[PDB]
Amino acid sequence: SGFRKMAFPSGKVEGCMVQVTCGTTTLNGLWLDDVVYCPRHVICTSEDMLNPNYEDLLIRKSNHNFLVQAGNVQLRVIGHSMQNCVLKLKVDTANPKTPKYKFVRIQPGQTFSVLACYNGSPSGVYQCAMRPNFTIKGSFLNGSCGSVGFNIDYDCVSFCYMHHMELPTGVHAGTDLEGNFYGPFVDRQTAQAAGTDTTITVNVLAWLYAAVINGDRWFLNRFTTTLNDFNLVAMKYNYEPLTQDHVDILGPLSAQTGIAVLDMCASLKELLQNGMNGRTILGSALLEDEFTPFDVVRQC
Amino acid sequence: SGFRKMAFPSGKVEGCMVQVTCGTTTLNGLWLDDVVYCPRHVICTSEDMLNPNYEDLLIRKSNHNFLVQAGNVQLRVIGHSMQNCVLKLKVDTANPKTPKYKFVRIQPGQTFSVLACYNGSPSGVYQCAMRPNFTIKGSFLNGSCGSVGFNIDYDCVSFCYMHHMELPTGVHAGTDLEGNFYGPFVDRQTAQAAGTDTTITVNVLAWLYAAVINGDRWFLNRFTTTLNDFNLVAMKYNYEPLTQDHVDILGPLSAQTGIAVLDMCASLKELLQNGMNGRTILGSALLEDEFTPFDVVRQCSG
Numbered sequence: 001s002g003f004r005k006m007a008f009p010s011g012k013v014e015g016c017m018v019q020v021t022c023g024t025t026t027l028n029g030l031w032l033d034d035v036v037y038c039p040r041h042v043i044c045t046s047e048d049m050l051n052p053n054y055e056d057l058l059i060r061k062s063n064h065n066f067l068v069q070a071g072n073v074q075l076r077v078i079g080h081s082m083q084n085c086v087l088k089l090k091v092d093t094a095n096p097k098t099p100k101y102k103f104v105r106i107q108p109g110q111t112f113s114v115l116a117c118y119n120g121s122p123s124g125v126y127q128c129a130m131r132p133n134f135t136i137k138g139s140f141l142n143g144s145c146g147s148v149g150f151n152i153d154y155d156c157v158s159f160c161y162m163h164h165m166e167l168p169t170g171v172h173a174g175t176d177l178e179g180n181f182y183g184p185f186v187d188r189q190t191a192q193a194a195g196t197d198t199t200i201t202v203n204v205l206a207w208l209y210a211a212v213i214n215g216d217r218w219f220l221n222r223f224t225t226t227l228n229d230f231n232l233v234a235m236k237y238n239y240e241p242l243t244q245d246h247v248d249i250l251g252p253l254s255a256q257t258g259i260a261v262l263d264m265c266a267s268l269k270e271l272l273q274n275g276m277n278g279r280t281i282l283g284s285a286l287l288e289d290e291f292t293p294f295d296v297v298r299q300c
Numbered sequence: 301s302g303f304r305k306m307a308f309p310s311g312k313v314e315g316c317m318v319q320v321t322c323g324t325t326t327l328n329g330l331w332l333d334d335v336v337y338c339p340r341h342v343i344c345t346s347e348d349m350l351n352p353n354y355e356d357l358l359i360r361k362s363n364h365n366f367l368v369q370a371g372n373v374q375l376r377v378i379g380h381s382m383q384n385c386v387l388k389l390k391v392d393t394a395n396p397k398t399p400k401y402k403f404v405r406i407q408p409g410q411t412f413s414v415l416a417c418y419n420g421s422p423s424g425v426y427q428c429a430m431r432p433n434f435t436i437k438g439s440f441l442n443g444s445c446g447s448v449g450f451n452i453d454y455d456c457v458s459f460c461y462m463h464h465m466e467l468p469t470g471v472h473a474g475t476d477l478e479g480n481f482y483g484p485f486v487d488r489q490t491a492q493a494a495g496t497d498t499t500i501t502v503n504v505l506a507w508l509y510a511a512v513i514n515g516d517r518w519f520l521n522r523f524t525t526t527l528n529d530f531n532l533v534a535m536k537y538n539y540e541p542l543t544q545d546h547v548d549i550l551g552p553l554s555a556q557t558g559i560a561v562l563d564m565c566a567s568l569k570e571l572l573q574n575g576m577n578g579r580t581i582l583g584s585a586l587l588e589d590e591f592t593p594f595d596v597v598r599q600c601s602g
């Protein structure tokens with residue numbers, strides 16, 4: 001029993017983290033097979049950063065301008081290219097610790113583990129949700145760029161995020177492993193801000209199921225609701241609308257507990273309309289939205 | 301920037317987890333050098349757990365009754381002994397992935413990372429505090445006994461917890477890696493309950509500093525207070541008392557922020573009397589007490 005914001009075991013990713021230095025920048029790289037992936041802004045000087053021409057800059061670099069250090073070993077760079085905002089450094093040695101892996105692009109609302117690293121050295125692990133506004137609320141210090149987010153499928157690591165950017169507001173943005181940003185952000189130090197964030201409604205529901213599974217049920221009620229009535233209320237609190245896809249995804253929790261999705265939606269509808277009254281759920285005074293339906297199943 | 305409940309990277313522990321079976325029980329063992337540590341209650345049937353005589357039961361087991369599997373390779377057990385409430389199984393092979401480690405006993409209020417496992421397979425990692433009642437609020441499923449808690453000090457893994465028990469309350473109890481329980485719990489299936497918990501005051505203040513470092517500062521107040529003053533209020537609210545030792549360990553945070561510890565205690569006293577008024581701190585509507593001062597320094601410095 002019990003319920004925790006739990007990350008995936010990070011050992012398979014720790015074995016892939018290396019230190020990448022170009023010019024005056026040191027940050028993290030992800031060594032898989034014979035390639036090291038890292039943010040392409042590593043090739044910029046802090047003056048270049050407002051309007052860098054990355055193609056022109058990369059052409060002007062040589063392999064020997066990149067220092068890749070695997071703990072205590074120095075990896076010879078023998079090629080380099082760009083895919084969108086990700087720099088790919090070909091090295092002369094395959095990483096023997098390379099796990100089975102996939103590159104995946106996730107959707108807002110989905111969660112993943114972040115291995116925060118500093119100058120190639122793993123520092124800590126935590127669970128993140130991709131917010132509806134395409135940011136994450138992470139924890140990073142200098143040298144953390146190139147840290148990655150991942151999920152694990154039994155044996156296979158799905159890499160879904162690489163850390164690039166901290167906005168002046170303190171929110172974090174980054175790319176998938178194809179170098180495409182999540183959200184409308186660009187890797188230039190121009191004025192940028194994230195859209196209005198919203199609550200991940202399907203995750204709140206999932207967590208309410210986790211609460212029932214743990215015996216917490218003061219918030220249940222005799223009412224059921226329609227998806228349109230629920231969504232009219234949700235929009236008034238900046239909650240994402242619920243779709244029938246969300247309802248299906250909740251299906252397993254609905255069966256495991258005997259509480260229909262739209263019966264549980266009425267519980268959330270009531271909590272939003274009337275509030276919590278200084279009661280808590282799974283130890284929280286606020287509604288939690290960083291557990292997907294799958295996270296709750298996995299843990300419960 | 302940012303602030304998260306972050307665990308230590310778990311890879312050094314993942315390489316030590318193995319599966320242990322005895323009789324009708326499968327759970328986890330910790331494979332270090334040529335010994336596998338696991339809960340002694342692995343030798344018990346459900347009926348034994350009503351009143352187990354561990355010494356009699358262990359006598360009657362042979363090395364071949366212990367099936368230890370490291371991934372898909374089986375390890376030969378060559379001796380077994382009991383150390384308090386943990387079994388030590390001697391195997392014929394040293395673990396090649398043994399990290400630099402030590403065994404340590406922590407104090408309530410201290411935090412550690414938990415690598416939750418299922419029958420030898422790492423499943424997830426999260427950060428816990430040892431509560432003042434010597435329980436931990438964990439997340440475990442069947443086959444999770446023998447999962448361990450740990451901290452990492454640069455290269456060195458400090459093992460501090462092994463999971464044994466889930467209380468009717470849904471909270472968790474276990475031992476250090478020497479086999480001694482944290483708290484007044486026993487590995488017998490008898491009525492047990494977690495005593496009164498309390499809030500870890502020095503940790504709450506650590507988190508208020510984290511919040512200041514991250515821009516949240518509405519709760520900073522004009523006022524200021526003394527230790528005895530604050531400790532009076534604290535106890536009325538089931539907050540642990542604040543010692544001059546706690547003031548010292550907050551010293552780095554106070555020095556980095558320019559807010560004296562007793563100044564911040566004034567803010568905490570106000571929050572306790574007046575609540576947050578629908579405001580939040582670091583996105584919490586409640587006061588968080590599972591970050592130690594070291595945790596904040598580590599994550600908000602390096």
Ligand SMILES: *C(=N)N1Cc2cc(F)ccc2OCCCN(C(=O)COc2ccc(Cl)cc2Cl)[C@@H](Cc2ccccc2)C(=O)N1C
Pocket residue numbers: 027041049140141142143144145146164165166167168186187188189190191192301
């Ligand atoms: C990654 N290693 N880092 C360093 C770092 C770490 C940290 F915890 C906080 C900030 C920080 O970098 C400081 C500035 C560089 N930076 C940014 O993302 C800053 O971005 C912006 C700042 C100001 C304004 Cl007006 C707009 C923006 Cl977008 C990145 C590199 C980068 C810069 C600009 C765009 C994209 C990436 C960075 O080095 N980091 C986060």
Ligand SMILES: *C(=N)N1Cc2cc(F)ccc2OCCCN(C(=O)COc2ccc(Cl)cc2Cl)[C@@H](Cc2ccccc2)C(=O)N1C
Pocket residue numbers: 001327341349440441442443444445446464465466467468486487488489490491492
């Ligand atoms: C560890 N592998 N497990 C299994 C397990 C996992 C889980 F997520 C939830 C329960 C559970 O164990 C079921 C019962 C065995 N158990 C207990 O801790 C139960 O403890 C108690 C039950 C009833 C009463 Cl009145 C008091 C207690 Cl404390 C342990 C083994 C154990 C039994 C009894 C005392 C201490 C340890 C167990 O196998 N586990 C948690």
Ligand SMILES: [Cl-]
Pocket residue numbers: 284285286583584585586
């Ligand atoms: Cl809260």
Ligand SMILES: [Cl-]
Pocket residue numbers: 361362363364
């Ligand atoms: Cl024997």
